[PDB]
Design an enzyme around this catalytic site. Sequence first.
Site, mmCIF file in Angstrom:
data_model
loop_
_atom_site.group_PDB
_atom_site.id
_atom_site.type_symbol
_atom_site.label_atom_id
_atom_site.label_comp_id
_atom_site.label_asym_id
_atom_site.label_seq_id
_atom_site.Cartn_x
_atom_site.Cartn_y
_atom_site.Cartn_z
ATOM 1 N N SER A 119 0.784 -1.291 0.009
ATOM 2 C CA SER A 119 -0.190 -0.150 0.123
ATOM 3 C C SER A 119 0.578 1.327 -0.104
ATOM 4 C CB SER A 119 -1.102 -0.155 1.224
ATOM 5 O OG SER A 119 -2.067 -1.325 1.064
HETATM 6 C C1 LIG Z 1 -7.731 5.120 1.598
HETATM 7 O O1 LIG Z 1 -6.997 6.152 1.138
HETATM 8 C C2 LIG Z 1 -5.942 6.087 1.233
HETATM 9 C C3 LIG Z 1 -5.096 5.122 1.816
HETATM 10 C C4 LIG Z 1 -3.521 5.254 1.576
HETATM 11 C C5 LIG Z 1 -2.477 4.014 2.247
HETATM 12 C C6 LIG Z 1 -3.115 3.009 2.736
HETATM 13 C C7 LIG Z 1 -2.146 1.922 3.467
HETATM 14 O O2 LIG Z 1 -1.056 2.061 3.167
HETATM 15 O O3 LIG Z 1 -2.809 0.973 4.058
HETATM 16 C C8 LIG Z 1 -2.953 6.487 1.024
HETATM 17 C C9 LIG Z 1 -3.844 7.440 0.820
HETATM 18 C C10 LIG Z 1 -5.277 7.241 0.504
HETATM 19 O O4 LIG Z 1 -5.800 8.224 0.289
#
Ligand SMILES: COc1cc(/C=C/C(=O)O)ccc1O
Length: 275
Positions: A119
């Site tokens: 992520s």
């Molecule tokens: C749900 O929106 C997001 C999630 C992430 C990262 C998530 C993770 O690293 O678990 C980053 C930016 C976002 O806008």
Amino acid sequence: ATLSQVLDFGNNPGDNEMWIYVPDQLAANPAVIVALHGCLGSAEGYYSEVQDLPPAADENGFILVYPGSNDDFHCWDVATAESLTHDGGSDSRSIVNMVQYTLDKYSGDSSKVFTTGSSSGAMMSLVLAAAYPDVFSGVAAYSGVPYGCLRGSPGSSPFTADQACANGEVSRTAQEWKDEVKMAWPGYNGTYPKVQVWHGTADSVISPNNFDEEVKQWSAVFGVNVTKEEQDSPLDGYTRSIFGDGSHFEAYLAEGVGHVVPTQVDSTLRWFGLI
Ligand SMILES: COc1cc(/C=C/C(=O)O)ccc1O
Ligand SMILES: *[C@@H]1O[C@H](CO)[C@@H](O)[C@H](O)[C@H]1NC(C)=O
Ligand SMILES: *[C@@H]1O[C@H](CO)[C@@H](O)[C@H](O)[C@H]1NC(C)=O
């Protein structure tokens, strides 16, 4: 072995922590793999999350570096000009400095530095690929977002970023995404590291539309089309797309898998040339 903290690795513009796992039986000129946690996580958390990585370090004699972010809800900065740009600063420069410290102190092989993450950490892995192709030989991004999608966003977290990227609302042409990569290091003349991306079709956190955008991005960077596809590879429901002669870019879409695709250590280490 055990994970331990490095208190001083040099200049630290991102104000990050550095943790390191050095196996008992090390290669003479060891490779280095940077393993990047996701939002709301930590270096110690990711060390525990990807349970297959430390044993692979034990078996193959490479070093694992786990950078840690304590800013922006423990997310990696993939939004500021500094972090997105070669030699710009912020988290990406701190991570590169962790790599340099490790190579120097452990007599590592500077030609065998890799990064993987999940992520937010996958987002940063693609930043490192685009902004520091002079440092990294290969990257593996699990459930991330194309490089530059969050450029100019007021943050990089579920609570601070522009949510268009995570929601799958940002679509650009392959050429536009290639232009983004070039913006990481304007005037760079060289090659880019091998890029491996993974995403799950059921991911409710980072939209799987981002998989299509990453494919457009890196197929354009390398000038390649899909030449081969493997079903149920490496696991049932995973479709592996191989591009060109397979030496630069491959992509996996996992049916039914959500946030995040679990790290497939064999597939990633083989991509890095380590097994
Ligand atoms: C749900 O929106 C997001 C999630 C992430 C990262 C998530 C993770 O690293 O678990 C980053 C930016 C976002 O806008
Ligand atoms: C790329 O090549 C041009 C050719 O003159 C040079 O000016 C430029 O400095 C090179 N880029 C880098 C990053 O060295
Ligand atoms: C990729 O596909 C496009 C259209 O399908 C084609 O025009 C182009 O020549 C292909 N490139 C390669 C390297 O095969």
